[PDB]
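To close the chapter, one final illustration. This time we ask the reader to focus less on the individual chains and more on the assembly as a whole: which components sit near each other, and how the overall shape emerges from the parts.
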Amino acid sequence: GITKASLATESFISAASFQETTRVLTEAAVAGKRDELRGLKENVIVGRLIPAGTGYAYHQDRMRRRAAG
Amino acid sequence: SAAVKEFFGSSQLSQFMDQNNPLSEITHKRRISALGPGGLTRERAGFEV
Amino acid sequence: AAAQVLSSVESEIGRTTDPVRMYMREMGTVELLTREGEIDIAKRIEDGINQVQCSVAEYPEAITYLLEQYDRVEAEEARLSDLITGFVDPNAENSIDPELAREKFAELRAQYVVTRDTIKAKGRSHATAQEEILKLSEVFKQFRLVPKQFDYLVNSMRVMMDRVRTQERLIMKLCVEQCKMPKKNFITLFTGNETSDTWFNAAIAMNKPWSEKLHDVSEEVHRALQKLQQIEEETGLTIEQVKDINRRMSIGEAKARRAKKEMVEANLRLVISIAKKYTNRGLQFLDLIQEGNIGLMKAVDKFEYRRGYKFSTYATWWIRQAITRSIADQARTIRIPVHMIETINKLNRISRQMLQEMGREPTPEELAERMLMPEDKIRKVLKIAKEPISMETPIGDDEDSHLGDFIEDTTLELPLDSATTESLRAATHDVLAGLTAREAKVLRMRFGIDMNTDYTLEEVGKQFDVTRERIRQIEAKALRKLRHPSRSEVLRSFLDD
Amino acid sequence: RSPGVFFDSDKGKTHSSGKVLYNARIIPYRGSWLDFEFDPKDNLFVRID
Amino acid sequence: KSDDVNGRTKMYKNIVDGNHQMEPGMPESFNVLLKEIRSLGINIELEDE
Amino acid sequence: MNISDVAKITGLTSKAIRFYEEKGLVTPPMRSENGYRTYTQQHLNELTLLRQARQVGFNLEESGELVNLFND
Amino acid sequence: TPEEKLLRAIFGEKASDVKDSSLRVPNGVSGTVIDVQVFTRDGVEKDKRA
Amino acid sequence: EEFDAIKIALASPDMIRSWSFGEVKKPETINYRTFKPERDGLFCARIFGPVKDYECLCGKYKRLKHRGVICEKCGVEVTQTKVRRERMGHIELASPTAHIWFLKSLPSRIGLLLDMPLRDIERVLYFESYVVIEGGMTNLERQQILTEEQYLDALEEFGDEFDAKMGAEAIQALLKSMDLEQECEQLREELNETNSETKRKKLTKRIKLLEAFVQSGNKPEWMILTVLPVLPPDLRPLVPLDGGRFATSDLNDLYRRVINRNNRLKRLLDLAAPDIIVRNEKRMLQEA
DNA sequence: GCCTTGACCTTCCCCTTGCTGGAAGGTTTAACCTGTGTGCAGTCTGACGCGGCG
Ligand SMILES: [Zn+2]
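The assembled structure is written out below.
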């Protein structure tokens, strides 16, 4: 289903945004979660560039920096 | 006195009336509602009403 | 049976959550029992402390005793205050004059000096030595207990036993964890000697192949028994009678302990009655009810039975004071101590009658007259009388937005004035470049620019050199250099800053 | 809504049935309410407030 | 234009020097949220790069 | 003794007595554990002496010396 | 600060232990005054314009 | 500013301490005219840091001149008032308590772990039914529910030889007791027998849950609260407006009452009073 | 521009009578009186979980 796919997500923060943040972060902090910051929203809240638009061209540089530390 | 003055001035029925035009007054007092206590709510309420 | 019915009810609590139900449906179990509950519980409590104070006497180890405390307080020639009022004081079944005390504190000395000699009369437990024990006791049993000071007399046992006991535990910590030992043999053998390690060979006579491996820790084991034995030398009496007196008065205090309980459970319903009579909405139900329970504790924990009244009323007003304080200490995040509180109370007690007999609100001067006290107090009272109003109140017509939006951060900066101040600084040091290096530098430091701290006249001097007044005249020099209506224009607008 | 006594008929909310749900209610100017109603499986039930 | 403080001040000072440049940081409402989670018994944190 | 009873017996008030004790003008009265200044018949007559001493004209100092006289 | 300190060391002007609370016209508004009303407690002196 | 990733886990008492600066000890805030924070109240600058930019409470230290320095009159350190935001507080408790989220959401995530109903656990912590810690004797078992009369019948049957209790510390020690590991491998293989719908699902979620606890490094011990953190003040302020009236982040109220009852408990702690009323106070805490 | 050089001022703390008034902070009274509640809340509701219960 649509909304359940929104909730049932790889990451948790955009999931933690808008619809029952409670259960999200409960089942997250028990689990030792960590998101790896490739969603848009994920880069919105920090205010960093999106991995996208104009910014994909730099986010790819960041991605090969993730490869090259 | 507490009860009565609270009603006459902090109920959501008393309002600062409309000093635009005469009809504004006469209609604003010739209003009817089903909001507030013993009443309804727009989200609770539907279309038939 | 209420537990019989609490059984079913708790079996089918309809997912109820309120501890009001829990506490009240629990304390409803035990009913009222008074009017001889009061007096028999009283006789039991006083019998508890009676057998305590009976136990207290005949003291071999608690050598510092009421005669000592009475000389310590009589060390500086005088006292008739409360700490004597606890002392011996035979009630004829209350300030104490010298001669009466000096008498009552004397035949006890006689019983001691005639008693301490027979302790060695063919043993601690001789017939006539025990006669002087029991007779010293009987000499005391006409008298009563003595004050909370006596607490430390009990402590002088515990802090010994706490130590002695601990050493045994310590010895066991050294004896019992590393190697194996028996627990049917160790007991009676340990009880056997109590003085020398003769139970060592007696226990090991079974030849106990683990007992052959008594090495590498014995230098600790025997040195932990050394601590117990040196405490035994310090005591000077081996312990079975001190244990007797201890558990005697220990049940003696537990007596009063558990006896005062059923008085706790006697009168809980008056407590809730009053708390709900005052839960006219000061704070909340339960905390009030609980302060009332402390109410009932201290009411019972001191009670005079001799008066012949009902316990409950004595208790009642004690409870009233406890809660009627605790309402007023707390119940505001602002602290307003009690004196202001009762001022406000009586103020309004007068205000109600001014409202009637005027039909109209009061005036500060009128109730100042009626109260006979001055204006500005009333002013600052009414300034202070009011309470805070909840950051997130709904100031909108609907939930439009609460009060938070309508608040200013009137604290931090103006970016305009920040940049303006940076510009002030820029222009100022630009000018300081334009004046003498000596004057400019020495004035940067004299006014504290270019560093953290501000030097002064003589200190700047004796850094530079000893001068005082030509330093002032150097200041005037720099003023003339700056006054100079060609360079002012970088600050002739900061004139207006 | 006035006081007195009102009736109504809900439209088979166990729409497995597609069946009527008659129910009746009183309303005072003050006090407690009362609700009478039929279940789908042919039995009366009642509830105050 | 909303939250970060160093940036807003710096850039004000800079465009007054005709500089159309940026120097970002991190917002404040974010760290607010961090504190308001850590209140709830939570070892939220951030990984170094 | 009861400190108010004593101050009314000597006519003074408690802070007067305390002021005088601050100035070391009498025998020291003890407290009680609750903190009540243990006055006395000794302090009774010391305070009555120190009372009439200044009404006569003896200051804090010479009236303290008069209570020294009595205590001598 | 040492620099405002410096300016008021140069010219030596001061501030009193009072400041202003002048009511003013909000921005952009302009107009005509046609009435004033003042209220004062019962007991305080009614001043000159009062 | 820069960083890689977000990281979440359960928090230890040790680390809630490590974050904090000093513990609070009383509920008050300020005077009613000399609007000045107290010691160990809620705005005490000692722990949270100073009040203005580098000024002490009395005015001893000022203007950055003594940077890493303290007015030990009050005991407030010379710093900016910028750290109103940051320096959280901490609190220690008498008896720990349970976090409502870790059960009272839908599925508990903690009682579920132990296959246990919610209602039993409710009856425990609102002090309605005892339970066995663990089976000392062979008669009775772990997770074995006890009502007080039944508790007692078992007691007079044995006396000392078992471990039974009502309250949370019971549950604390319980979840401390178990091991993820062997139960995980059990429920893994136990799947095989009846891998119908129900047995499979239940064993599934449990196995996954256990492994989650393992490999995250998280812990069941930390499920509940021997400690509590205090939020800094400016996030929860208490300030006047023009008319002379204060306004209060209502949170403040939610805090302050709690503290006082904690210390009330520490009063009664000196007494070994009837544990009934003590239970009343515990209930009151958990509710608050 | 280096030095005092003497001699004058202003401020700020601290001191000397004989107390007084104020603020904050404590502890006990014997006639008594024994299970709330107290105004909610008007039932929104469809999808979806899951507990018990067949
Ligand atoms: Zn300070």
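Chain H is about 35% helix and 15% strand. The CA atoms of residues 138 and 162 of chain H lie 9 Å apart. With these observations in hand, you are ready for the problems at the end of the chapter.
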